[PDB]
Amino acid sequence: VSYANAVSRAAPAVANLYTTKMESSLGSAVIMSAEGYLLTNNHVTAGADQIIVALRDGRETIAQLVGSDPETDLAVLKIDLKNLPAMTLGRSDGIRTGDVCLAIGNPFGVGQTVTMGIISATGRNQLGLNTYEDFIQTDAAINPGNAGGALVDAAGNLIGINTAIFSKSGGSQGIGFAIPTKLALEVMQSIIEHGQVIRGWLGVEVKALTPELAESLGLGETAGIVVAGVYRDGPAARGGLLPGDVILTIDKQEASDGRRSMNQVARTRPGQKISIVVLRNGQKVNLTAEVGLRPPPDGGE
Amino acid sequence: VSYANAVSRAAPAVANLYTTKMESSLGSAVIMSAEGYLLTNNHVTAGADQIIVALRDGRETIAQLVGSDPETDLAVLKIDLKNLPAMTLGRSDGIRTGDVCLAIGNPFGVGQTVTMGIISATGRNQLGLNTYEDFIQTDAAINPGNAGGALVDAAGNLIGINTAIFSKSGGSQGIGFAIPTKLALEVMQSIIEHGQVIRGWLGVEVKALTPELAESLGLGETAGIVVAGVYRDGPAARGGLLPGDVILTIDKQEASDGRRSMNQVARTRPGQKISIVVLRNGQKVNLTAEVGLRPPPDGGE
Amino acid sequence: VSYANAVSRAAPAVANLYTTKMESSLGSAVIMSAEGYLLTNNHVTAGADQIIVALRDGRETIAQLVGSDPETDLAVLKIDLKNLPAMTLGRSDGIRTGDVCLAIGNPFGVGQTVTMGIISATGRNQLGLNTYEDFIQTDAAINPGNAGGALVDAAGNLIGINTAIFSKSGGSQGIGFAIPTKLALEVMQSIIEHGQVIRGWLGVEVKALTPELAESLGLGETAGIVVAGVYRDGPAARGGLLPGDVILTIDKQEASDGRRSMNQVARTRPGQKISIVVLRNGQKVNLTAEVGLRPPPDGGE
């Protein structure tokens, strides 16, 4: 078959990044709107003193950093250039494992490069790369230099931002990871608006429901989550939260799973008052907390 | 195009294996029947003291070892679990080089992972990995952790058990090897029945027909095989067989090729009397032997 | 889908190469005509004392070296054998990035091997591998042992000669390079005719038009090329050419780009008189030169 039409569609909207820092390094980025906004990875541009964007048509320009988001490994850039080709968006929840995809980037600085593979899996958290993980996995060859570039579906629509690989060799072994478009678009929109992403911030821990601690517990291996360990000087601290008490309920929503609950708390607004309930065998043990702002906190695992 | 339907079909019947031994290691396995029998590689489970099977639906269970077959690198496991999804079988002789295939496994423990490539070649013996080799070769990315998992055709039917790779880097370089379904089903059936595979056993050697030894020989570079070297205390020993005499005929079938003849002898039954003929320029030199049982004897070449 | 028909078409015309030198090494080659001419890489056969060709059908024969071309990394071999299968030719300019292709070779000596990927990019010069570069890039897995073998389109027609890879691991990371058929056929035809390729030869340098040297220059960042540095005892030497003067015109054609101009000079005939113009702010500064012959001057970058 051929993916030429998909490449023709998407490749004009993928650029090369050349960054100098204290010294030179390489990457990719995706043009998201004709106004000149670009998505790339945080680790590509972090601390850079100059960022050059090189387009497929040959034009080069210096970019400005709009803002960056280390906890998803994303960053937004802005350029001032006319008649820019923008990427079409795919549906990252609309993808299935086994669908064909294309990676577009600048591996090893050889030039813009298209590789092909399939969606190997979706929803990869537990990789231990970023705080907020939801990776698409792909076997399209992805190498140092691909970071910040496009993962595209078989029609050329954007489904992710290529980010990381797992390798024992320094280069592709067919296990690569892209940030899904749905996550990346959120981050991008908020950075454009507020210079960063405003998360609901707690300063608290939580880990899995081990079986024997909840064995004695009346419920049976589901529908709850075990808590421990607490950060200090912040609102859970001031709200009476503390290592060892277990969390039934935060903002009235049961925090049954750790990753779910990170997200919910993340999608809250700082300064707001919300109630929190620590463990007792009954319904509640009632605390309150003022939602704070969370401070500030091609890769290979 | 998309392979999503093929993945939907086959992925439920591929499990993760977690084994502890004297210490923890990882692998994959394929559910072959709703009764709970699973195929995997011998090297994954060999000497394990505990074997956990983790299904795509989230269920986990301990497995029992039915039996194992080091000389093909296969092993059979059994689990006790209801409403199990079983793999459909493909036709491993029905495949052609250039057909698309999918590998399903747990590379590096990242999670169940689907990779895509083509049949690169079939019939790979001479790899020097197992005594009985007939590998399918594939460029679908295959890594440590894939061993024991499924190679599937473009419709999701099982064509092989992923086993080994050739790499200079510790991970996929696009040269991987799967045990064909036709071989694996034989092994599986006999292990389920007899706890191992019963081979016809000789205790004898044989190597290629070098050209100048058979130059003088009247026949012309075909249709025969040169012999040498003999194991002892066993039936060829007791049958009057010995290093240096060349084999015309075993069980009346001319042993013209070494790998062919291994197989024939393998598919004989121990305790049976069969006749053997050593080299002389005429028709025969007649010995007899009682067929013995052959004793006990993700990988990277 | 399946590429079996494409493999059936092309694989008979791809051979294994086994070369002994002062000691044994491996490679591939492509049968280009039924007369027994074969293309492979220069680095595979360079300095070999014996070259064996092994065909897919099992026939083996010794090959003769027709001639070789180090500056494109190509070499031509000849064998004497009947009923030979010849490769069909594709159109290497007719390919688009994103088209599917197949690599056919003998990676690591495992046997003839087919791998699949896409055209990742075309026109790769600046790799620094050969003097005359125009590589097709592909993510079809290509390993040591693939050099001299076929890159084929989805219908099995020849589009290139697999040559090199970029890797940090000694094997495929999905960045491989093939010499396009259009270049390779030229080289092959001239070697068959004249034992080598006759290039137009100058003995002179040239590098890019830096911006500030041509800033002051009236023209604006296009349509010219800056010169420097000169080889000696040869015709530019005898023609009055020299480091520092900048070249407007060679054989009346403006030498605006370095790689273009190499080619033009290459496609000229030795012994011919052609005029050359060095830099002055006006039209010309007029020299003459007698075109000389250029003397004599799976890889991993």
Coordinates of N, CA and C in Angstrom, one line a residue, chain A residues 127-198:
Chain A
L127 N 5.3 4.0 33.6 CA 6.6 4.0 33.0 C 7.6 4.7 33.9
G128 N 7.2 5.6 34.8 CA 8.1 6.3 35.7 C 8.9 7.4 35.0
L129 N 8.4 7.9 33.9 CA 9.0 9.0 33.2 C 8.5 10.4 33.6
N130 N 7.2 10.6 33.6 CA 6.6 11.8 34.0 C 5.5 11.6 35.0
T131 N 5.2 12.7 35.7 CA 4.2 12.7 36.8 C 2.8 12.3 36.2
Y132 N 2.4 12.9 35.1 CA 1.1 12.6 34.4 C 1.4 11.9 33.1
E133 N 1.2 10.5 33.1 CA 1.5 9.7 32.0 C 0.3 9.0 31.5
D134 N 0.2 9.0 30.1 CA -0.9 8.3 29.4 C -0.4 7.8 28.0
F135 N 0.8 7.2 28.0 CA 1.5 7.1 26.7 C 0.8 6.1 25.8
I136 N 0.8 6.5 24.5 CA 0.7 5.6 23.4 C 2.0 4.9 23.2
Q137 N 2.0 3.6 23.0 CA 3.2 2.9 22.6 C 3.2 2.5 21.1
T138 N 4.4 2.6 20.5 CA 4.4 2.3 19.0 C 5.7 1.6 18.7
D139 N 5.6 0.7 17.7 CA 6.9 0.1 17.2 C 7.4 0.9 16.0
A140 N 6.8 2.0 15.6 CA 7.5 2.9 14.6 C 8.9 3.3 15.1
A141 N 9.9 3.1 14.3 CA 11.3 3.3 14.8 C 11.4 4.8 15.3
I142 N 11.8 5.0 16.6 CA 11.9 6.2 17.2 C 13.2 6.3 17.9
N143 N 14.0 7.3 17.6 CA 15.4 7.5 18.0 C 15.6 8.8 18.6
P144 N 16.7 9.0 19.4 CA 17.1 10.4 19.8 C 17.1 11.3 18.6
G145 N 16.5 12.5 18.8 CA 16.2 13.4 17.7 C 14.7 13.4 17.3
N146 N 13.9 12.3 17.6 CA 12.5 12.3 17.4 C 11.7 13.0 18.4
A147 N 12.2 13.4 19.5 CA 11.5 14.0 20.6 C 10.8 15.3 20.2
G148 N 9.5 15.4 20.5 CA 8.8 16.6 20.1 C 8.1 16.6 18.8
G149 N 8.4 15.5 18.0 CA 7.8 15.4 16.7 C 6.5 14.7 16.7
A150 N 5.9 14.4 15.5 CA 4.5 13.9 15.4 C 4.4 12.4 15.3
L151 N 3.5 11.8 16.1 CA 2.9 10.5 15.7 C 1.6 10.8 15.0
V152 N 1.4 10.2 13.9 CA 0.3 10.5 13.0 C -0.4 9.1 12.6
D153 N -1.7 9.2 12.4 CA -2.5 8.0 12.0 C -2.3 7.7 10.6
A154 N -2.9 6.7 10.0 CA -2.7 6.3 8.6 C -3.2 7.3 7.6
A155 N -4.0 8.3 8.0 CA -4.4 9.4 7.1 C -3.7 10.7 7.4
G156 N -2.7 10.7 8.3 CA -1.9 11.9 8.5 C -2.4 12.8 9.6
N157 N -3.4 12.4 10.4 CA -3.9 13.2 11.5 C -3.0 13.0 12.7
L158 N -2.8 14.0 13.5 CA -2.0 13.9 14.7 C -2.7 13.2 15.8
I159 N -2.0 12.1 16.3 CA -2.5 11.4 17.5 C -1.5 11.5 18.7
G160 N -0.3 12.0 18.5 CA 0.5 12.1 19.7 C 1.8 12.8 19.4
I161 N 2.5 13.1 20.5 CA 3.8 13.8 20.5 C 4.9 12.7 20.9
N162 N 5.7 12.3 20.0 CA 6.8 11.3 20.3 C 7.7 11.9 21.4
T163 N 8.0 11.0 22.4 CA 8.6 11.5 23.6 C 9.8 10.7 24.1
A164 N 9.7 9.4 24.2 CA 10.6 8.5 24.8 C 10.7 7.1 24.1
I165 N 11.7 6.4 24.5 CA 11.8 5.0 24.1 C 12.4 4.2 25.2
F166 N 12.2 2.9 25.1 CA 12.8 1.9 26.0 C 13.8 1.1 25.2
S167 N 15.1 1.1 25.6 CA 16.1 0.5 24.8 C 17.3 0.2 25.6
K168 N 17.9 -1.0 25.3 CA 19.2 -1.3 25.9 C 20.4 -0.9 25.0
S169 N 20.2 -0.1 24.0 CA 21.2 0.1 23.0 C 21.4 1.6 22.6
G170 N 20.6 2.5 23.2 CA 20.8 3.9 22.7 C 20.0 4.3 21.5
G171 N 19.3 3.3 20.9 CA 18.4 3.6 19.8 C 17.3 2.7 19.7
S172 N 16.5 2.8 18.6 CA 15.2 2.1 18.5 C 15.4 0.6 18.6
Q173 N 14.6 0.0 19.5 CA 14.3 -1.4 19.5 C 12.8 -1.7 19.4
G174 N 12.1 -0.8 18.8 CA 10.6 -1.0 18.5 C 9.7 -0.7 19.7
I175 N 10.2 -0.1 20.8 CA 9.4 0.2 22.0 C 9.5 1.7 22.2
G176 N 8.6 2.5 21.6 CA 8.6 3.9 21.7 C 7.3 4.5 22.3
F177 N 7.3 5.7 22.8 CA 6.2 6.2 23.6 C 5.8 7.7 23.1
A178 N 4.5 7.9 22.9 CA 4.1 9.2 22.4 C 3.0 9.7 23.4
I179 N 3.0 11.0 23.7 CA 2.0 11.7 24.5 C 0.7 11.8 23.7
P180 N -0.4 11.3 24.1 CA -1.7 11.4 23.3 C -2.1 12.8 23.1
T181 N -2.7 13.1 21.9 CA -3.1 14.4 21.5 C -4.1 15.0 22.5
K182 N -5.0 14.2 23.1 CA -6.0 14.7 24.0 C -5.4 15.3 25.3
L183 N -4.3 14.7 25.8 CA -3.6 15.3 26.9 C -2.8 16.5 26.4
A184 N -2.1 16.4 25.3 CA -1.2 17.4 24.8 C -2.0 18.7 24.5
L185 N -3.2 18.6 23.9 CA -4.0 19.8 23.6 C -4.4 20.6 24.8
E186 N -4.8 19.9 25.9 CA -5.1 20.5 27.2 C -4.0 21.4 27.6
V187 N -2.8 20.7 27.9 CA -1.6 21.4 28.3 C -1.3 22.6 27.4
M188 N -1.4 22.4 26.0 CA -1.0 23.5 25.1 C -2.0 24.7 25.3
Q189 N -3.3 24.4 25.4 CA -4.3 25.5 25.6 C -4.0 26.3 26.8
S190 N -3.7 25.6 27.9 CA -3.5 26.3 29.2 C -2.2 27.1 29.2
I191 N -1.2 26.6 28.6 CA 0.1 27.3 28.5 C -0.1 28.6 27.7
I192 N -0.8 28.5 26.6 CA -1.0 29.6 25.8 C -1.8 30.7 26.6
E193 N -2.6 30.2 27.5 CA -3.5 31.2 28.2 C -2.9 31.7 29.5
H194 N -2.3 30.9 30.2 CA -1.8 31.2 31.6 C -0.3 31.0 31.8
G195 N 0.4 30.7 30.7 CA 1.9 30.6 30.7 C 2.3 29.3 31.3
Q196 N 1.5 28.5 31.9 CA 1.8 27.2 32.5 C 0.4 26.5 32.7
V197 N 0.4 25.4 33.3 CA -0.8 24.7 33.6 C -1.0 24.8 35.1
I198 N -2.2 25.3 35.5 CA -2.7 25.5 36.9 C -3.2 24.2 37.3

